[PDB]
Amino acid sequence: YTIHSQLEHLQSKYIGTGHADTTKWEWLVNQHRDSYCSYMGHFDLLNYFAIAENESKARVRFNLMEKMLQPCGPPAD
Amino acid sequence: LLPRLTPILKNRHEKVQENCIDLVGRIADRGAEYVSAREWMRICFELLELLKAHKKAIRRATVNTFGYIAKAIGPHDVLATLLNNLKVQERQNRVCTTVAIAIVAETCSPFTVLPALMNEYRVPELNVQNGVLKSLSFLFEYIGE
């Protein structure tokens, strides 16, 4: 259970993990944020979207980082 | 030379033991045919209780030479003498014989040893069934691909 002190330290360590009660909302929103961080990181899906819509890389990443805030609806209750 | 060296392998000291087993390993690698199978068998039986030295360099050297002897003589007699050691208790010489089994299998291809290991998985004792499982562990790690 000191293992648990370390393990909810691990929950505090890695944003996106889970535990047996985790809610569909936390799960899917964390995966959605991660999806955004990687669309930004990988230099080429950025071209994919930039080219799919008719936007430009500054436009693209600005949208993405705005969306990063409430990507999957408002919260659960 | 080597007949003179064999009574030194009993010198119970890390530095002289290190260098002696190095020299005998060179010789058994290159000289191989000059020494007789029976000599190598007696030396196998003596290695079986270096696996309890308090220093880990000794034990790693011991495992390596089990490998070299499996190359010079065939694998089957050395493998038979290793299973009977697995029957011992006290864990740190069981675990080092299980390393040695992995090493013999790595040098002389694993089909030579896998049937005997698997078949020994049927003797109803604990320490030995676990010896078989741990040896396959090391073997797949050594074999890798």
Binding site: - | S36, R38, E39, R42
Partner: protein, 56 residues
Amino acid sequence: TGIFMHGKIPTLKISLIQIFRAHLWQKIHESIVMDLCQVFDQELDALEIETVQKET
């Protein structure tokens, strides 16, 4: 076995029989001769021995 009796001492014969049961006389012969063969098997080098033959 290779024991000679000169009569009938039944109690003694029973003890001696129960001692050498299960062909132990020949087993002793086999173990001794095997050990000797092994000693030769090893010291072939010094002994100038090309071959050692254990007659089945």
